[PDB]
Amino acid sequence: AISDADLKYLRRCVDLAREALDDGDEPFGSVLVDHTGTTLFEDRNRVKDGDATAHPEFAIARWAARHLTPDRRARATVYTSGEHCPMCAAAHAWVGLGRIVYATSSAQLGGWLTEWGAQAPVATLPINTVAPGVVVDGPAEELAETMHNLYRAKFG
Amino acid sequence: AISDADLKYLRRCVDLAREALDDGDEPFGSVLVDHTGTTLFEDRNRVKDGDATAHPEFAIARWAARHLTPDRRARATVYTSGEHCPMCAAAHAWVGLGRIVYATSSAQLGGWLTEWGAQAPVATLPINTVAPGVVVDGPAEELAETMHNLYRAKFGR
Ligand SMILES: O=c1nc[nH]c(=O)[nH]1
Numbered sequence: 001a002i003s004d005a006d007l008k009y010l011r012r013c014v015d016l017a018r019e020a021l022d023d024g025d026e027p028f029g030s031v032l033v034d035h036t037g038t039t040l041f042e043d044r045n046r047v048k049d050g051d052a053t054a055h056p057e058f059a060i061a062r063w064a065a066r067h068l069t070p071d072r073r074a075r076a077t078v079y080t081s082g083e084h085c086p087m088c089a090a091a092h093a094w095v096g097l098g099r100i101v102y103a104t105s106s107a108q109l110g111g112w113l114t115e116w117g118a119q120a121p122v123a124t125l126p127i128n129t130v131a132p133g134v135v136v137d138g139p140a141e142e143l144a145e146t147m148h149n150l151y152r153a154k155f156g
Numbered sequence: 157a158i159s160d161a162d163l164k165y166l167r168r169c170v171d172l173a174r175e176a177l178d179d180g181d182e183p184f185g186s187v188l189v190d191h192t193g194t195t196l197f198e199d200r201n202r203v204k205d206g207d208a209t210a211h212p213e214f215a216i217a218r219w220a221a222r223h224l225t226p227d228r229r230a231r232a233t234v235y236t237s238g239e240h241c242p243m244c245a246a247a248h249a250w251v252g253l254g255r256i257v258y259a260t261s262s263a264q265l266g267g268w269l270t271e272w273g274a275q276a277p278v279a280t281l282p283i284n285t286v287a288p289g290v291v292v293d294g295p296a297e298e299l300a301e302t303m304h305n306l307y308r309a310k311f312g313r
Pocket residue numbers: 026028045054055056057082083084085088
């Protein structure tokens with residue numbers, strides 16, 4: 001299930017990814033939403049200053065650990081422009097966050113990166129290989145070409 | 157594949173894991189060693205304050221990204237009492253650290269946790285399934301029962 005409301009959040013993730021690209025970082029953005037539908041926290045990739053672990057899903061996991069009780073974490077949704085790498089999927093599950101919705105799969109990105117000779121040093125594992133209990137929805141097919149464009153701008 | 161010097165560092169990791177256990181955290185310890193044999197940073201698990209991501213291998217990855225050039229990271233070694241979880245294995249690869257030596261594998265721990273009904277929400281994937289290019293050595297048969305007992309002291313029933 002990717003609802004109309006889900007797609008709106010995913011479109012905000014894409015806007016954050018573009019913000020990251022325009023700032024010199026890599027095009028990934030993510031938002032954390034409460035069960036009430038209140039946006040709690042938003043972030044984007046910040047690796048350009050030297051720390052390759054500065055992925056927004058990871059920032060969300062640590063933010064949730066600090067600011068939400070486990071019960072609220074479990075009922076929260078994370079939206080992301082790109083499917084959590086294994087680092088971020090593992091962090092998500094460790095802190096006990098709930099549903100993940102992503103725009104493009106890590107398989108999509110890995111395929112595109114392979115076309116450009118830009119493969120990552122971390123494997124493109126689907127979230128549920130890393131985090132078997134997490135409910136995962138995605139990809140949103142309507143956002144494939146849009147995200148491919150941002151990825152190409154960075155890695156192409 | 158585990159030298160005398162390597163085993164000394166793994167024994168320090170077990171000491172750090174015991175410090176963690178005694179302090180109310182979980183028994184994981186890690187050390188980052190330069191190519192010269194100097195200890196650069198030592199850490200242990202700190203999850204008791206409510207952040208389940210407070211793993212020492214991850215702290216080491218961020219320490220490396222802050223303080224070391226890529227060439228120095230590639231020549232550094234990370235020792236750990238327990239094989240990196242996927243969070244920590246990925247972080248290690250993202251930052252471009254080098255060899256990992258571990259005392260016990262995540263499969264070993266996973267089997268033991270199953271004995272106690274204390275399964276993690278993160279899969280027990282081998283490091284090279286997450287980070288295919290990393291050189292990985294371990295486990296160390298000499299530290300199997302030591303580490304089994306420390307894990308039992310936190311997770312056992
Ligand atoms: O910021 C990021 N988020 C997911 N994967 C990735 O490579 N980078």
